[PDB]
């Protein structure tokens, strides 16, 4: 297991434009295209992202390329954020993956907003952090995924993805 397989499990793979859990146009392995309700706007974002006229359909190779870019972006977002970087640096590799997963799903700004959870994680108060993380719109809207990510923070193992 690793962050790529972890996110493939959580996000799946769809080669045509779909809507994510919030109703936003998305493609591939959880690649958000736009928050606009316009499919045409989403298609324009897709073409720009892939570098060709796609008409809403991509190949697996293309989906994987976007995915690699998006994981990279999540990691750099963490490292450039003054709230996220010290927490990330304090964590072991498995729990670092849990933090990347969160940023992949909700963005740097969103995760950086988990101020109290982040503090508990830096203090290595795992059970307390797990309870605090679940007191969130995140957990209430995507509870099974959030439970997997929280279990990863709580235990420092990949047990929730086996």
32 annotated as ligand-binding: yes
Domain boundaries for CATH 1.10.530.40 within the chain: 1-60, 81-156
Active site positions, annotated: 11, 20
Task: Give the torsion sign (CA, 110, 70, 16, 158).
Answer: negative
Q: Where in 31-119 does DSSP place strands (E)?
A: 31-32
Structure-determination technique: X-ray
104 annotated as ligand-binding: yes
> Within a 10 A sphere around the Cβ of 96, how many other Cβ atoms?
17
- Using the structure block, give the residue that is written with the tokens 């907003």: 113
Look at phi and psi of residue 124 and say left if phi exceeds 0, alpha if psi is from -120 to 50, else beta. Answer: left
For the domain 81-156, what is the CATH code?
Answer: 1.10.530.40
Tell me the HSE value of 75 on the side-chain side, using a 13 A CA sphere: 11
Distance in angstroms (rounded) separating the CA atoms of residues 90 and 104: 19
CB 45 within 8 A of CB 63: no
Residue 81 burial (CB < 10 Å; 0-12/13-18/19+)? middle
Query: Is domain 1-60 given the CATH code 1.10.530.40 in the classification?
Result: yes
Reduced to 3 states, what is the DSSP secondary structure of residue 54? Answer: coil
Q: Helix 126-134 and helix 143-155: axis angle, to 10°?
A: 170
136 annotated as ligand-binding: no
Tell me, in Å, the resolution of the deposited structure: 1.5
33 annotated as ligand-binding: no
First CA to last CA distance, the chain: 8
Q: What are phi and psi of 29, to 5 degrees?
A: -100, 75
Q: What letter would DSSP give residue 12?
A: -
Lookup: tokens for 38: 């316009």
Lookup: tokens for 74: 């999540």
Q: Where in the chain does DSSP place strands (E)?
A: 14-19, 25-28, 31-32
């Amino acid at each position: 297991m690793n962050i790529f397989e972890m996110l493939r499990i959580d996000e799946g793979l769809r080669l045509k434009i779909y809507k994510d859990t919030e109703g936003y146009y998305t493609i591939g392995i959880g690649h958000l295209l736009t928050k606009s309700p316009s499919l045409n706007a989403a298609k324009s974002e897709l073409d720009k992202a892939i570098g060709r006229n796609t008409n809403g359909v991509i190949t697996k190779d293309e989906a994987e390329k976007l995915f690699n870019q998006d994981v990279d972006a999540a990691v750099r977002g963490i490292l450039r954020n003054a709230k996220l970087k010290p927490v990330y640096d304090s964590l072991d590799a498995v729990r670092r993956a849990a933090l990347i997963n969160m940023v992949f799903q909700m963005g740097e700004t969103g995760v950086a907003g988990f101020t109290n959870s982040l503090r508990m994680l830096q203090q290595k108060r795992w059970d307390e952090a797990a309870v605090n993380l679940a007191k969130s719109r995140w957990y209430n809207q995507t509870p099974n995924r959030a439970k997997r990510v929280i279990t990863t923070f709580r235990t420092g193992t990949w047990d929730a993805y086996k």
